[PDB]
């Protein structure tokens, strides 16, 4: 059980850890989060009480280092940092644990939600989408634009998602124009799976990471990425059977977890209706279609 | 962006552009089978690709053999249209290639955009105009070469005949669309109107009769009457 301790809480803020969140008052004696499950990536995120603009946060894996959160009054935000002195960090964590100034990661034992949302998400892949190689953790916020968004302006602060574009030479073989545009199996299986991602796990990992950034930060480019990666599978007539079954589970848990009140901005009507009702895979996502019809029958 | 009433004059500037109409690509007759079911028989069609500034028409004849053993022919027809348009552009010298291609039906946008990926600088545009190019098969010489074809064939015409010797391309295009609009609303009447006097012969190398300026003015007026009338006969006014 690992710990992300906090130096202090000088400004009022709503702090999230994965799908949980709590309110911290200005100068409240808050000193971090303990009992964080080992074996998954995690995200710790922030919304200041004064400026609900800019949600921001940090993707991390406690196996890769000892991390602490400290508020910077010059840059005006909570910053994640690495403590390279392990004795000093364990000692600071033990002090805080003894004074009971930490909240406990509040996981119900029956609950596999976070595992199901991050099954294929790897810290090493996150660090290639979010390039800042001198840190072992990755910063994301509501306003960061994606590489593909930049093409259509500071590249150091970009989300380097894999570019998917259905009307592109990468997607369309000369002489197979109609075939490749109406059935994207070539693009999915040869270009993306075999060529860029190498395997379906890496594809699903980027899909899941894009969704989580869309949900937790309202990052529009990430939502675009999530839908495009769904649509590419659903618009392919030939998909490995194990991928379709796994996709149905992935989407089920994403739709289950989405805040009911945010469905209007985060769910693209055209893509979901195409995917559930028109596409080749219209009959292959039974769990996702049942939860979508029972939870968001308006969108459909 | 879309082509409409408001940017109409762009059609006659010095930027090469083509209209593409696919209405007459996939043509069928519907009939009863001996069992009493219904079936279709394809007939020859054509792509109508027109430079509105010069009058140059690239009439690609679509032979029925191209549909043999194919499914979803109305969908295929749009992709075949885009394939042939792309091939036409690729066949032209660079300085003759269009800067824009305007499709008369929105369903052609994605097929043509995908076939033209090699030409990122050629803009593919829809239009808000309801142009009457479907009536091109009411022009006797065009209908004749389409129906006689025994294999795929491209035929080149100037749909303005020699009009640009005397009038501008704006005026020529307006005359063409009036004639075609009339033929589409009442083909019999429209065609009668061309032949009311029969001394005004069609030259062998032309599509329309050899009217004087003064006789065109009369013709054009009579086609506007026809269209109004049919609009009454149809809507009752
Ligand atoms: C000691 C010092 O310079 N403290 C000031 C900031 C600070 C360093 N930190 C290292 C590990 C854990 C925590 C909360 C932490 N806080």
Those residues with Cβ within 8 angstroms of residue B144's Cβ, 6 or more apart along the chain or in another chain: none
The preferred substitution site among A6, A7, A73 for testing ligand 1, maximizing ligand atoms within 8 Å of CB, is: A7
CA B27 – CA B43 distance, rounded (Å): 6
Residue A255 has, within 13 A of its CA and on its CB side, a CA count of: 24
DSSP structure string for B100-161: EEEESSGGGHHHHHHHTTT-TTSEEE-BSS---GGGGGGSHHHHHHHHH-SS-EEEEEETTT
> Residue A54 corresponds to which tokens in the numbers above?
């800019």
Is the CB of residue B115 less than 8 Å away from at least one CB of chain A? Answer: yes
CA distances from B161 to B72, B131, B158 (A): 37, 20, 5
Gaps in chain A following residue numbers (C to N > 2.5 A): 152
Dihedral class, residue B236 (left if φ above 0, else alpha if ψ from -120 to 50, else beta)? left
Q: Quote the CA–CA distance of A164 and A232 in Å, as a whole number.
A: 8
* Percent of chain B that is helix, strand, coil (3-state, to 5): 45, 20, 35
DSSP 3-state of B173: helix
For B151, other C-beta atoms within 10 Å of its C-beta total 7
Terminal Cα-to-Cα distance of chain A (whole angstroms) = 43
Q: Which residue, among B112, B182, B181, B145, has the nearest Cα to B46 in the 3D structure?
A: B145
- Residue B60's Cβ-side half-sphere holds a number of Cα atoms within 13 Å equal to 22
What are the angstrom distances between the C-alpha of B32 and each of B38, B39, B44, B67?
Answer: 5, 6, 20, 20
> What is the radius of gyration, based on Cα positions, of chain A?
20
Read off the tokens for B43. Answer: 């007939």
For β-strands A32-36 and A42-48, DSSP reports them as unpaired
DSSP label of B168: -
Q: What angle do CA B94, B96, B97 make, to 5 degrees?
A: 70
**Domains of chain B: residue spans and CATH:** 9-163 (3.30.420.230), 164-237 (1.20.80.40)
Cβ of A167 within 8 Å of Cβ of B82? The answer is no
Distance CA B138, CA B135 (A): 5
* B174: enclosing H helix or E strand: helix B169-185
Decide: helix, strand or coil at residue B22: coil
Rounded CA gap, B17 and A276, in Å? 40
Q: Residue A172 and residue B76: Cβ atoms within 8 Å?
A: no
CA dist., res. B26 & res. B39, Å (int): 15
For A181, the closest of B76, B114, B118 (CB atoms) is: B114
Do A167 and B117 make contact, defined as CB atoms within 8 angstroms?
yes
Chain A residues whose beta carbon lies within 8 Å of the beta carbon of residue B111: 177-178
Which CATH number is A192's domain given? 1.25.40.550
B10 in contact with chain A, both atoms CB, cutoff 8 A? no
The number of beta carbons lying within 10 Å of the beta carbon of residue B107 is: 14
Could you tell me the strand order of the sheet in which A2-5 lies?
A2-5, A32-36, A103-104
- How far away is chain B from the Cα of A6, in angstroms, using its nearest Cα? 53
Rounded Cα–Cα distance for residues A122 and B207 (Å):
69
Q: Which domain range does residue A291 map to?
A: 116-299
Task: In whole angstroms, give the CA distance from residue A293 to residue B16.
Answer: 50
Q: Are A122 and A176 in contact (CB under 8 A)?
A: no
**Centre of ligand 1 from the C-alpha of residue A10, in Å:** 14
Rg (CA), chain B: 19
CA closest to A174 among chain B residues:
B115
User: Residue B20: in which H helix or E strand, if any?
Assistant: strand B17-21
Q: Are B57 and B66 in contact (CB under 8 A)?
A: no
According to DSSP, the residues that pair with A71 across neighbouring strands are A78
Q: What count of other Cβ atoms lies within 10 Å of the Cβ of residue B92?
A: 12
d(CA A15, ligand 1 centre) in Å: 19
Round to whole Å and give the CA distance between B67 and B44.
10
SS3 letters across chain A: CEEEEECCCCCCEEEEECCEEEEECCCCCCCEEEEECCCCCEEEEEEECCCCCCCEEEEECHHHCCEEEEEECCCCEEEEEECCCHHHHHHHHHHHHHCCCCEECCCCCCCCHHHHHHCCCCHHHHHHHCCCCCCCCEEEECCCCEHHHHHCCCHHHCECCCCCCCCCCCCCCCCCHHHHHHCCHHHHHHHHHHHHHCCHHHHHHHHHHHHHHHHHHCCHHHHHHHHHHHHHHHCCCCCCHHHHHHHHHHHHHHHHHCCHHHHHHHCCHHHHHHHHHHCCCCCCCHHHHHHHHHHCCCCC
What phi, psi does A168 have (nearest 5°)? Answer: -140, 155
Structure-token match 């003015």, residue found: B217
Q: Are strands A42-48 and A13-17 parallel, antiparallel or unpaired?
A: antiparallel
SS (H, E, C) B85-101: HHHHHHHCCHHHCCCEE
């Amino acid at each position: 059980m690992n710990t992300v301790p906090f130096t202090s809480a000088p400004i009022e803020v709503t702090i999230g850890i994965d799908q949980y969140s709590f309110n911290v008052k200005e100068n409240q004696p808050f000193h971090g989060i303990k009992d964080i499950p080992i074996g998954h990536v995690h995200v710790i995120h922030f919304q200041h009480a004064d400026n609900s603009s800019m949600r921001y946060g940090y993707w991390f894996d406690c196996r890769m280092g000892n991390f602490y959160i400290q508020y910077d009054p010059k840059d005006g935000l909570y910053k994640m940092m690495e403590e390279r002195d392990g004795a000093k960090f364990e000692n600071i964590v033990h002090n805080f644990k003894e004074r009971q100034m930490m909240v406990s990661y509040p996981k119900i034992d029956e609950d596999d939600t976070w595992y199901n949302l991050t099954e294929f998400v790897q810290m090493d892949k996150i660090r290639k989408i979010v390039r800042k190689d001198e840190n072992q953790f990755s910063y994301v916020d509501s306003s960061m634009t994606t590489v593909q968004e930049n093409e259509l302006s500071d590249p150091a602060h970009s989300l380097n998602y894999t570019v998917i574009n259905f009307k592109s030479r990468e997607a369309i073989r000369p002489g197979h124009e109609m075939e490749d545009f109406l059935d994207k199996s070539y693009y999915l299986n040869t270009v993306m799976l075999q060529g860029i991602f190498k395997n379906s796990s890496n594809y699903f990992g980027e899909l899941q990471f894009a969704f989580l950034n869309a949900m937790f930060f309202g990052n529009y480019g990430s939502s675009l990425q999530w839908h495009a990666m769904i649509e590419l599978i659903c618009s392919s007539a030939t998909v490995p059977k194990h991928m379709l079954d796994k996709l149905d589970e992935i989407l089920y848990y994403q739709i289950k977890t989405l805040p009911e009140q945010y469905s209007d901005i985060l769910l693209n009507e055209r893509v979901w209706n195409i995917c559930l009702y028109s596409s080749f895979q219209k009959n292959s996502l039974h769990n996702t279609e049942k939860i979508m019809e029972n939870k968001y029958p308006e969108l459909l | 962006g879309a082509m409409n009433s408001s940017n109409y004059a762009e059609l006659f500037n010095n930027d090469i552009k083509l209209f593409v109409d696919d209405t007459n690509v996939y043509r069928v007759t519907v009939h009863k089978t001996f069992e009493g079911n219904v079936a279709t028989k394809a007939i020859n069609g054509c792509i109508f690709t027109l430079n509105p500034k010069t009058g140059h028409l690239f009439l690609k004849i679509i032979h029925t053999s191209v549909w043999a053993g194919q499914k979803r022919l109305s969908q295929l027809a749009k992709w075949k249209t885009a394939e042939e348009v792309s091939a036409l552009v690729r066949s032209l010298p660079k300085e003759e290639q269009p800067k824009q291609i305007i499709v008369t039906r929105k369903a052609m946008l994605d097929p043509l955009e995908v076939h033209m990926l090699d030409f990122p600088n050629i803009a593919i545009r829809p239009t808000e105009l309801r142009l009457p190019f479907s009536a091109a098969m009411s022009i006797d010489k065009l209908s004749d070469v389409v129906m006689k074809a025994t294999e795929p064939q491209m035929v080149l015409f100037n749909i303005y005949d020699d009009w640009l010797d005397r009038i501008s391309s704006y005026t020529a295009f307006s005359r063409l669309t009036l004639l075609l609009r009339a033929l589409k609303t009442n083909e019999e009447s429209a065609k009668m109107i061309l032949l009311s006097d029969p001394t005004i012969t069609i030259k062998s190398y032309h599509l329309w009769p050899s009217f004087t300026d003064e006789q065109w003015i009369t013709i054009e007026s009579q086609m506007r009457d026809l269209i109004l009338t049919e609009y009454g006969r149809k809507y009752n006014v």
